[PDB]
Design a binder for this molecule. Structure first.
Ligand SMILES: NC(=O)c1ccc[n+]([C@@H]2O[C@H](COP(=O)([O-])OP(=O)(O)OC[C@H]3O[C@@H](n4cnc5c(N)ncnc54)[C@H](OP(=O)(O)O)[C@@H]3O)[C@@H](O)[C@H]2O)c1
Ligand SMILES: NC(=O)c1ccc[n+]([C@@H]2O[C@H](COP(=O)([O-])OP(=O)(O)OC[C@H]3O[C@@H](n4cnc5c(N)ncnc54)[C@H](OP(=O)(O)O)[C@@H]3O)[C@@H](O)[C@H]2O)c1
Ligand SMILES: O=C(O)c1cccc(-c2noc(-c3ccccc3F)n2)c1
Ligand SMILES: O=C(O)c1cccc(-c2noc(-c3ccccc3F)n2)c1
Lengths: 206, 206
């Protein structure tokens, strides 16, 4: 495997769990950063390496990025919609670690709202969207090989591998399953064609 | 009251650098206060005068303000996550220096958080916002002609000169390009219509 060692940030989350399971099945040697109170579930897939800590500590992010081939970022705030900088500050630490350790490839999830007319973004989701905007600027300005993944609504539909990938604009559907989103994050490790683009994965489940 | 000579504080920052560049291209005689002159670009537009020192040092601020027609303030304490007083103590020094030298016009950047509910502030930005509020009060209470510039997200989009300014709060956008923000700071030197007002610049790009 050319890319074989990967860090996943947010592996315990909705998309992270199925991304982790798919990566382990595909032969990746996965390192995760998990907060001490929220470890991976007991008998799901086991990653190769676990760092317990916080993306808001540069030291913990450095430990997680060291020695990787690539980084996948699925940070988020679960059902909490309050103002936050955890995604943007976490990305700042991830950028600094990747530069210090010679890692170039980062595939990172923000949101399709970065491609919406700003006056149409739902106000209830605007605090989170603000930090996605901050996070995207951090990653775009870093000079790293950054794939900006900007999904629409994340659902519980199957893994299909059959989704549309729209470059630098909104796509033709308004959902992507969490499993297909994770599949796409991993696909981005095997190609350079999305580097420096925004990507909107979406599908019609039928 | 033609403004020819300005001081810029914060000229090495993201907004400061493009404000300086635009000011030099437009013809202003610019004085900057920098802690490290090697953070100024060695090519292209350069300031007329460089004072090496610290905004916390009253004598360095006095040296920078002497003889100016107006002052632009683009200070920031980016890294600070917990109580900090650099911006407000700097503003106190700038105010005392402007009074001592008969400089009447100051255009200073805080943030749009000062226009929105305090609960909108991400916890890790509360300390910077608290000191923006302190700086804003220092400048409002000074009696100087003060334009308060309260931008939302500062982006990287190319200069347009086509942004909207709302004298109080809302707009097409929660983003202003750093280039457009610097353009607006300089526009405030050529008019008195924003004196004693808060301003919110924003724009929809792309
Ligand atoms: N329809 C949607 O839901 C939708 C649509 C578009 C975009 N998005 C965005 O897509 C991204 C992924 O969403 P998701 O639903 O898969 O994620 P999620 O379930 O919200 O999971 C967030 C992950 O981030 C981890 N995390 C949070 N703070 C951390 C910290 N300080 N240190 C280390 N890890 C931290 C969480 O760990 P813990 O286990 O410790 O909490 C969890 O693993 C999010 O940014 C989201 O806003 C969602
Ligand atoms: N980032 C955003 O999206 C955003 C949004 C709204 C408002 N704001 C606020 O906008 C203002 C400007 O932001 P920015 O990103 O353009 O600033 P920045 O890139 O963080 O630059 C801060 C500037 O202030 C200088 N500075 C800091 N401490 C100093 C000191 N003791 N003495 C002399 N100079 C000092 C810095 O000098 P050095 O180069 O020597 O460090 C630098 O030039 C800030 O107050 C910020 O909080 C930012
Ligand atoms: O409907 C669409 O096209 C669309 C596009 C972008 C994002 C979304 C979206 N829905 O829930 C969320 C969300 C829910 C919980 C937490 C954070 C979120 F971000 N985000 C929907
Ligand atoms: O990132 C910082 O250091 C910082 C410091 C002070 C204010 C701000 C700020 N105000 O509005 C916003 C904002 C608004 C909409 C979207 C994204 C944003 F980021 N951001 C940021």
């Amino acid at each position: 495997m050319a890319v074989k060692k990967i860090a996943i940030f947010g592996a315990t989350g909705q998309t992270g769990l199925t991304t982790l399971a798919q990566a382990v099945q595909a032969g990746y040697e996965v390192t995760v950063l998990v907060r001490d109170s929220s470890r991976l579930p007991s008998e799901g897939p086991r990653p190769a390496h676990v760092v317990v800590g916080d993306v808001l500590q540069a030291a913990d992010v450095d430990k997680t990025v060291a020695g990787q081939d690539a980084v996948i970022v699925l940070l988020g705030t679960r059902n909490d919609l309050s103002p936050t900088t955890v995604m943007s500050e976490g990305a700042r630490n991830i950028v600094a670690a990747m530069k210090a350790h010679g890692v170039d490839k980062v595939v990172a999830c923000t949101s399709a709202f970065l491609l919406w007319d700003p006056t149409k973004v739902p106000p209830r989701l605007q605090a989170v969207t603000d930090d996605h905007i901050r996070m995207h600027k951090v990653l775009r300005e870093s000079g790293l090989k950054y794939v900006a993944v900007m999904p629409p609504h994340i659902g519980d539909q199957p893994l299909t591998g059959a989704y549309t990938v729209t470059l630098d604009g909104r796509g033709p559907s308004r959902v992507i399953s969490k499993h297909d989103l994770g599949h796409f994050m991993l696909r981005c490790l095997t190609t350079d064609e999305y580097d420096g683009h925004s990507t909107y994965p979406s599908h019609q489940y039928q």
